Amino acid sequence: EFMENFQKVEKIGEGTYGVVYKARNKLTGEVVALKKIRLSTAIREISLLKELNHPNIVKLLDVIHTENKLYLVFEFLHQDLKKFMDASALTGIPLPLIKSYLFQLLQGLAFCHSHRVLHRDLKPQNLLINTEGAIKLADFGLRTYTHEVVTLWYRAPEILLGCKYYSTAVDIWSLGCIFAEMVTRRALFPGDSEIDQLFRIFRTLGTPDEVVWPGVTSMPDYKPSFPKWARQDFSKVVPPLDEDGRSLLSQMLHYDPNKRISAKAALAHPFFQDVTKPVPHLRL
Ligand SMILES: Cc1ncc(-c2ccnc(Nc3ccc(S(C)(=O)=O)cc3)n2)n1C(C)C
């Protein structure tokens, strides 16, 4: 019944919760992204997200509950960062554009974190970009319905070690992983299981201990039998990124979530002293 309001133009995602269509509001001709989830607590919580409006958050226009389906109607953007990263792979995204995207995402996070909203599943597939140089956070997250594996590559270590309470720091870790990936053109920690993800982190950043992360050894999934890898330098991890970028990235990848840089503090980092807003070249 609801779909009679909307012309499905094409399928754009098999999102974490459901399928997303580009669609055209049959009466207004507004073009939107429409997410169909298959099925009260959620209705109330998701309805509150209609108020979490910011230029770097994809605008949630409406939330419809009808006939054991939840539909979410969003402002439409034309592509994700994953596709831009894959397209820019031979050449690299120019540093000023990486910088601008990071700064923008940080502004978005600072906003939602100030309102005690976490994302919990940041990844290149839910960062969306336009021709005007904007990037926006989509698909806030609290197998897929198509049985596709949900990616672990940007999961913070506290999640992987079983922490029950997430803090805003989980987002900062995800974004640091994405920043590194923009710079190097390869995923930082491409785990293909929970333990493979954790051990990739450990192999690059050192196996965490009580010195760098007090309370780590008391975590639910911590095991004394984890191998003990020494830390590597960042100069090896994200060459040829400059000192300011390296320093920022190191702070976004602190193990302790209480030491990890906040979005707000990251926006003050000297890395952004010369930030600008370049226009990407998009082929739509
Ligand atoms: C999970 C989710 N919920 C809402 C969206 C959403 C919201 C706004 N616009 C879009 N547009 C879009 C996404 C990806 C691509 S493509 C060709 O690069 O795959 C093309 C256009 N999508 N999404 C996205 C993240 C699928």
From Swiss-Prot:
Its needed co-factors are: Mg(2+)
Enzyme Commission number(s) of this protein: 2.7.11.22
Catalytic residues of the enzyme:
121
The UniProt annotation places Mg(2+) binding at 126, 139
Q: What is this protein called?
A: Cyclin-dependent kinase 2
Q: What induces it?
A: Induced transiently by TGFB1 at an early phase of TGFB1-mediated apoptosis.
Protein residues bound to ATP: 12-20, 35, 75-77, 80, 123-126, 139
Q: Which PANTHER family match?
A: CELL DIVISION PROTEIN KINASE (PTHR24056), CYCLIN-DEPENDENT KINASE 2 (PTHR24056:SF521)
Which compartments does it reside in?
A: Cytoplasm, Cytoskeleton, Microtubule organizing center, Centrosome; Nucleus, Cajal body; Cytoplasm; Endosome
Described purpose of this protein according to its UniProt entry: Serine/threonine-protein kinase involved in the control of the cell cycle; essential for meiosis, but dispensable for mitosis. Phosphorylates CABLES1, CTNNB1, CDK2AP2, ERCC6, NBN, USP37, p53/TP53, NPM1, CDK7, RB1, BRCA2, MYC, NPAT, EZH2. Triggers duplication of centrosomes and DNA.
Q: Which residue positions does Phosphotyrosine occur at?
A: 17, 21
What does the record say about how the cofactor binds? Binds 2 Mg(2+) ions.
Q: Which stretches make up the Protein kinase domain?
A: 6-272
A GO CC annotation recorded here is: cyclin E1-CDK2 complex
Instruction: Supply the gene name.
Output: CDK2
* Variant or mutagenesis effect after changing residue 152 to R: Reduced phosphorylation by CAK and reduced kinase activity
Q: Does Transcription show up as a keyword for this record?
A: no
Residues that the record marks as modified (N-acetylmethionine) are 3
Q: Which residues carry this modification: Phosphothreonine?
A: 16, 146
Domain of life assignment: Eukaryota
